[PDB]
Amino acid sequence: SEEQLNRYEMYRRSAFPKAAIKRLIQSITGTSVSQNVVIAMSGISKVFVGEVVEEALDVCEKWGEMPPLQPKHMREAVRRLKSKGQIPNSKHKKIIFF
Amino acid sequence: RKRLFSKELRCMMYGFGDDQNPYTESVDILEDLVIEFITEMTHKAMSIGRQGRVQVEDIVFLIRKDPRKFARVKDLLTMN
Amino acid sequence: NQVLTKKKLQDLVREVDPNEQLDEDVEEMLLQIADDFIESVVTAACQLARHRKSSTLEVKDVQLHLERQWNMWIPGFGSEEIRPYKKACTTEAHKQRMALIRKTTKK
Amino acid sequence: SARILATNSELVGTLTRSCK
Amino acid sequence: IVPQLQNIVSTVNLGCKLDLKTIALRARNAEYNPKRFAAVIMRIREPRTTALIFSSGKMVCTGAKSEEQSRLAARKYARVVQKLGFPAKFLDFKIQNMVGSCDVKFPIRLEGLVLTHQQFSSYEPELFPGLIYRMIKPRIVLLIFVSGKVVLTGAKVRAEIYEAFENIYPILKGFRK
Amino acid sequence: TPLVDFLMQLEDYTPTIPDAVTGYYLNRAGFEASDPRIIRLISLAAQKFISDIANDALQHCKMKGKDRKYTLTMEDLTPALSEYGINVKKPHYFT
Amino acid sequence: MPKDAQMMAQILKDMGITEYEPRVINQMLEFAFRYVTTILDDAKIYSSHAKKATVDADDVRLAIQCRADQSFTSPPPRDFLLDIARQRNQTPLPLIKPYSGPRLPPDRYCLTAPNYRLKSL
């Protein structure tokens, strides 16, 4: 239609800027990264945003609300993703044997 | 901290079906989630492989388990 | 002076499966679990605040207790930029004692 | 390169909203 | 619409082995950087043209904008090598590549173009802001942009560029914005 | 039923862990396994877990670069176990 | 025998343990290495949270006390078991019906159930 073609345009053309993530990663490493790191790390974070919004619209469709996304559907989105191990936290030393 | 992903993330939520005009608080939650994800991936990458260096190989091992993200990394590298 | 009021709890069950009821015993136990969680998190955060030689509970030390113990990252608040991650401060005494395990093993 | 992003500030996000 | 050529890459064998230091020291506008690349980079001015001269006597000539201009610049490079003292014959001259570009005068919508021709078109916005469409029969690579500018590369003759543009024009008119 | 479909697929796979070994560790856990397909599913799940830990260890070993024979040293197994809930901490150099 | 395995036999001898397996001393040194490198794990997280340079003694003192609730949780105290009992010990004992056959709880607390199994098709 005429909205699906505009939505497909924003699904492809949108990206995080490489001039800021290269500034963001290098504040964590200390020295330097490469261009093929920033190209991949800018691409995984678009999949991760698409992992949340496609699942936060499943929370909103499950409850009785409309397309505008309140934060109620966004804290619930991170809760359901973390219970399936999708959201990694490297500060919780987990233990499976008890 | 200011918001470094305020205008970029509003195009992306529209790309996955949200609205043309999302809420500022929802955009803020998404920006915080993206920063936390990038930080976690960078620490694990520094630990795995060459200590103190984050490489594409380390990032690929880290994302190997999740199918959607692994496919995207491979496609982007091949297209590049 | 109660924090959960048995209507916010009922909507928390209605959002999961709307054809589901709790019994009086289950409702009371869930309220008790909520109260216990609040008390533990608050005490630990207050101990971390006392440690920072401060007298104000910020959000930076309710973060560190939920992440390390309860596996909870509450997204929509934001932190300061994390400092460059120090990887290995291995000391000289470990660099010379572990260089004796290999000296006996291969030589 | 900047024309793919310039149209990404005219169409999406015209008014800024909020929520209680 | 006609596509005008912008770049012609040709190659010519001189047949005589060259030591590059005397050519770099005697000839003008000659650049030699061995720790970087193993050829002599000499530019002329009348036809804005650049030659990489190699030590085995093979020369790559690039920058001209027709076949006759590329051949005339290659002859000029051969005679400026000749007059230094090397016996240089114009053995074989072959044009490796011809590059042309054109404007089709309307904005193009690339998402339908990758939707209906995904066998021959690889399009990734993030890195390159363009769509690579590979024509199977002409053997040309076309960078199609959203603003309407098309770049045709990877051709040996002029008629291949012309036939590839006449091939890809009705598809682009069918996908006007 | 996903579990039933998986059992139908299993009607061919034979696990490395034998049924008497698995059928004994269910006896210490609290039941005598009557149906010999439940034993097979549990054994296959355990086999998958061990295989994943070992393969992650092999991947760390291959990444350090030595390419002839791969030894299952503790330096490759200890980071490979921490991705699951096994946190070993072995000492060295007892003073 | 290092000086901390020579002292680990002294600790078990000071208890009522005179006859132990020789594998026990190798086990009680792995537990004692895992404990101090978990306290000093948390004592480095708390030093950076208060933003200091070294690991002081008040960081290790907090790291000891803030993991005596999850890593080494206790059986319930004597002041709590007395209060739970003395309200349970005040309701009277009920009377017994004369002929009820097998005396059992209600059916949702017992293990009597039809206990199905798959049709081996």
mmCIF file of C-alpha atoms in Angstrom, chain B residues 9-76:
data_model
loop_
_atom_site.group_PDB
_atom_site.id
_atom_site.type_symbol
_atom_site.label_atom_id
_atom_site.label_comp_id
_atom_site.label_asym_id
_atom_site.label_seq_id
_atom_site.Cartn_x
_atom_site.Cartn_y
_atom_site.Cartn_z
ATOM 1 C CA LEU B 9 15.778 5.286 17.266
ATOM 2 C CA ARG B 10 12.481 6.930 16.293
ATOM 3 C CA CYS B 11 13.068 5.919 12.672
ATOM 4 C CA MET B 12 13.840 2.365 13.781
ATOM 5 C CA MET B 13 10.694 1.889 15.893
ATOM 6 C CA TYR B 14 8.642 3.084 12.918
ATOM 7 C CA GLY B 15 10.578 0.490 10.911
ATOM 8 C CA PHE B 16 9.264 -2.317 13.133
ATOM 9 C CA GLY B 17 5.640 -1.204 13.399
ATOM 10 C CA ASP B 18 5.390 1.202 16.347
ATOM 11 C CA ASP B 19 4.120 4.611 15.060
ATOM 12 C CA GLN B 20 5.311 7.667 13.220
ATOM 13 C CA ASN B 21 5.371 9.482 16.599
ATOM 14 C CA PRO B 22 6.510 7.283 19.498
ATOM 15 C CA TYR B 23 6.649 8.405 23.141
ATOM 16 C CA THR B 24 9.825 10.043 24.505
ATOM 17 C CA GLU B 25 9.910 7.674 27.544
ATOM 18 C CA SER B 26 9.738 4.585 25.243
ATOM 19 C CA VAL B 27 12.553 6.018 23.067
ATOM 20 C CA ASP B 28 14.574 6.555 26.309
ATOM 21 C CA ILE B 29 14.033 2.921 27.440
ATOM 22 C CA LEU B 30 15.177 1.688 24.002
ATOM 23 C CA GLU B 31 18.312 3.928 24.058
ATOM 24 C CA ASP B 32 19.289 2.674 27.550
ATOM 25 C CA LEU B 33 18.782 -0.950 26.409
ATOM 26 C CA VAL B 34 21.002 -0.405 23.311
ATOM 27 C CA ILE B 35 23.816 1.173 25.382
ATOM 28 C CA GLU B 36 23.695 -1.694 27.942
ATOM 29 C CA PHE B 37 23.731 -4.348 25.150
ATOM 30 C CA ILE B 38 26.747 -2.714 23.441
ATOM 31 C CA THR B 39 28.636 -2.481 26.780
ATOM 32 C CA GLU B 40 27.958 -6.152 27.690
ATOM 33 C CA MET B 41 29.025 -7.376 24.249
ATOM 34 C CA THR B 42 32.233 -5.269 24.408
ATOM 35 C CA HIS B 43 33.235 -6.642 27.860
ATOM 36 C CA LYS B 44 32.651 -10.255 26.842
ATOM 37 C CA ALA B 45 34.617 -9.656 23.587
ATOM 38 C CA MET B 46 37.554 -8.154 25.537
ATOM 39 C CA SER B 47 37.592 -11.295 27.787
ATOM 40 C CA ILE B 48 37.244 -13.887 24.931
ATOM 41 C CA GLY B 49 39.957 -14.207 22.217
ATOM 42 C CA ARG B 50 42.735 -11.576 22.356
ATOM 43 C CA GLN B 51 42.571 -9.979 25.835
ATOM 44 C CA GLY B 52 42.015 -6.189 25.610
ATOM 45 C CA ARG B 53 41.082 -6.253 21.888
ATOM 46 C CA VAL B 54 37.523 -6.498 20.461
ATOM 47 C CA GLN B 55 37.613 -8.206 17.027
ATOM 48 C CA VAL B 56 34.957 -9.329 14.465
ATOM 49 C CA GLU B 57 35.858 -13.000 15.200
ATOM 50 C CA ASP B 58 35.146 -12.552 18.956
ATOM 51 C CA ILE B 59 31.867 -10.740 18.186
ATOM 52 C CA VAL B 60 30.839 -13.634 15.833
ATOM 53 C CA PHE B 61 31.585 -16.304 18.485
ATOM 54 C CA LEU B 62 29.532 -14.307 21.030
ATOM 55 C CA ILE B 63 26.511 -13.994 18.667
ATOM 56 C CA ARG B 64 26.746 -17.623 17.319
ATOM 57 C CA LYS B 65 23.892 -18.969 19.525
ATOM 58 C CA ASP B 66 21.230 -16.422 18.392
ATOM 59 C CA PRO B 67 20.217 -17.163 14.737
ATOM 60 C CA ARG B 68 18.725 -13.777 13.672
ATOM 61 C CA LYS B 69 21.745 -11.713 14.810
ATOM 62 C CA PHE B 70 24.377 -14.191 13.443
ATOM 63 C CA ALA B 71 22.734 -14.192 9.994
ATOM 64 C CA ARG B 72 22.735 -10.356 9.898
ATOM 65 C CA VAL B 73 26.439 -10.135 10.868
ATOM 66 C CA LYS B 74 27.412 -12.647 8.170
ATOM 67 C CA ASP B 75 25.287 -10.885 5.503
ATOM 68 C CA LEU B 76 26.707 -7.427 6.349
#
